[PDB]
Homo-oligomer: A and B are copies of this chain.
Amino acid sequence: DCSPGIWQLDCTHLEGKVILVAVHVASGYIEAEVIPAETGQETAYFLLKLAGRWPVKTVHTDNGSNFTSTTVKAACCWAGIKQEFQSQGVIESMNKELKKIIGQVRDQAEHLKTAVQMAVFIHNHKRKGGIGGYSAGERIVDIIATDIQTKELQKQITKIQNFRVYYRDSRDPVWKGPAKLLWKGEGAVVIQDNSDIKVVPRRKAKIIRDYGKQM
């Protein structure tokens, strides 16, 4: 539930211009930008560009100083992103391997930035030599879109949760208490119990008009 919407960004201290890298921590997607001059404000316009390609719920910050800039914090509010208080070192090292391929292309491009963007293209559209069903370069907007189906799902889940159906086991003075209902059918209605299990006929089952909680 936590992994979604989460993005980790690493600053790069580099020959020539400084640069910073942005990845959904799970996705592995990379959109690094070469930094002409470093200001949190400067950091922000890109972070602003970063949101359109993908939404980020929040970003943890490597640097308290990139954190200190008022604009940098200012951006977290427009976004609604909250600044959050070995392997990532290996990810920067992967950026270094990327820098090595960037070295392989260093001859190819005078502009270090080009190399970095290429390196980004390199993390992207990348397939493991070990067989992988899913490419990490093929980070899935979809697994973020499944939950997107999930939000609508929970939404459907909430309306069912909103309805309470009450039933009576047959020939029972007692009337069975409210519980989430597993299914609705014209022939039969299925119900769910916690610390108990039950299912029911549709006639014992009843139909309710929608009562909505917290608009």
Contacts and interface: CB of A to CB of B under 8 A. Distances in A.
Interface string A77-119: 0110000000000000000000000000000000001100110
Contacts of A48: 114, 117-118, 121
A7 to B, nearest CB: 13
B133 A141 contact: no
A93 B145 CA distance: 29
Contacts of A125: 55
Q: How many copies does the complex hold?
A: 2
A31 B49 contact: yes
Interface in A50-66: 51-55
A173 to B, nearest CB: 42
Contacts of A9: none
A134 to B, nearest CB: 8
A69 interface: no
Contact of A141 (B118, B121, B142): B142
A54 B144 CA distance: 13
A142 B144 contact: yes
Contacts of A145: 140-142, 144-145
A114 B41 CA distance: 11
A175 interface: no
Nearest to A108: B78
8 contacts: A29-B52, A31-B52, A45-B113, A48-B121, A53-B54, A53-B124, A55-B124, A141-B145
